[PDB]
Amino acid sequence: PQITLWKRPLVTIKIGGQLKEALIDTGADDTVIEEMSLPGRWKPKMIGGIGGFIKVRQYDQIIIEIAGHKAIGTVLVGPTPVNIIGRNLLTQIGATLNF
Amino acid sequence: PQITLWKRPLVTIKIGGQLKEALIDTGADDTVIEEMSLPGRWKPKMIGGIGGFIKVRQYDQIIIEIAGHKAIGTVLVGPTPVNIIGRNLLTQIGATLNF
Ligand SMILES: CC(C)(C)NC(=O)[C@@H]1CN(Cc2cccnc2)CCN1C[C@@H](O)C[C@@H](Cc1ccccc1)C(=O)N[C@H]1c2ccccc2C[C@H]1O
């Protein structure tokens, strides 16, 4: 598929048995998901946005399905205002920017 | 070109006649550049992302070259951690996401 940039590039994802909407974000190094109760162990992390840092829980080896394509990797969970799919997972689905 | 996402998608820009490096950021609604002197009138604005808000100067109708492609549009200037090319200018240069 191709996604234009007139509007925020939102897609459906599946994570932890739930469907959500998420932003395809080439500027994000990491994937950040809104607060949800994912199972198992996690590690504390702080991550920086344009405005400063927030506290998140780092979960490793988490499977996400992104617009029908699987990715496995690290997912950060915390109080983000949007679900963000970052480069760590976008590479796995073969996503590119083109112009 | 076609840009993969294993590294940050950094490109060279020209703004106010000066070369800078900037991040292609599909998760950014707007374009924000680190503090610099820029010709034109501006108006105060606030933008928010992860971590909160920053105060910026909004410059309308600014000529900017992005990886050799011309755009003319709104450029925000302020204490962003990195120079960011957002959707307002990515649309101008014809950028799409593909997977
Ligand atoms: C891993 C994490 C998500 C924390 N990364 C970021 O936030 C990075 C931070 N770097 C910086 C950094 C910080 C620390 C270390 N390395 C890099 C700058 C680039 N952002 C990526 C942005 O695309 C993130 C989005 C998130 C968002 C989208 C919609 C609404 C709220 C939040 C973002 O901040 N977008 C905002 C945005 C951005 C620019 C201009 C205007 C606007 C408005 C809004 O679209």
Question: Cβ(A27) to ligand 1 under 6 A?
Answer: yes
CATH code reported for the domain at B1-99: 2.40.70.10
| Residue extents of the structural domains in chain A | 1-99
The structure was resolved to a resolution in Å of: 1.1
Half-sphere exposure of A70 (CA within 13 A, CB side): 5
Atom of ligand 1 nearest to the CA of A26: 23
Whether B82 lines ligand 1, by a CB cut-off of 6 Å, is yes
Alpha helix stretches (DSSP H) within chain A = 87-90
What is the rounded distance in angstroms from the CA atom of residue A62 to the CA atom of residue B59? 42
Nearest CA to ligand 1 atom 15: A48
Q: List Cβ neighbours of B67 (8 Å cut-off, separation of 6 or more).
A: A99, B1, B11, B12, B13, B93
Handedness of CA A87, A89, A92, A93 (dihedral sign): negative
Cβ–Cβ under 8 Å, residues A87 and A71: no
Pocket lining: B85 vs ligand 1, CB cutoff 6 Å: no
Residue A55, Cβ density class (10 Å: 0-12 exposed, 13-18 middle, ≥19 buried): exposed
A3: tokens are 């996604």
Q: Please state, in angstroms and rounded to a whole number, the distance separating the CA atoms of residues B27 and A27.
A: 6
- Evaluate whether B54 touches B5 at the Cβ level (below 8 Å): no
The helix/strand/coil state of B9 is: coil
Burial of A15: CB neighbours in 10 Å, binned 0-12, 13-18, 19+ = buried
Give, in order, the Cα–Cα distances in Å from B33 to each of A18, A34, B9, B83, B93. 37, 28, 16, 5, 18
Q: Cα of B23 to ligand 1 centre, how many Å?
A: 11
Contact B64, B77 (CB under 8 A): no
First to last CA, chain B: 15
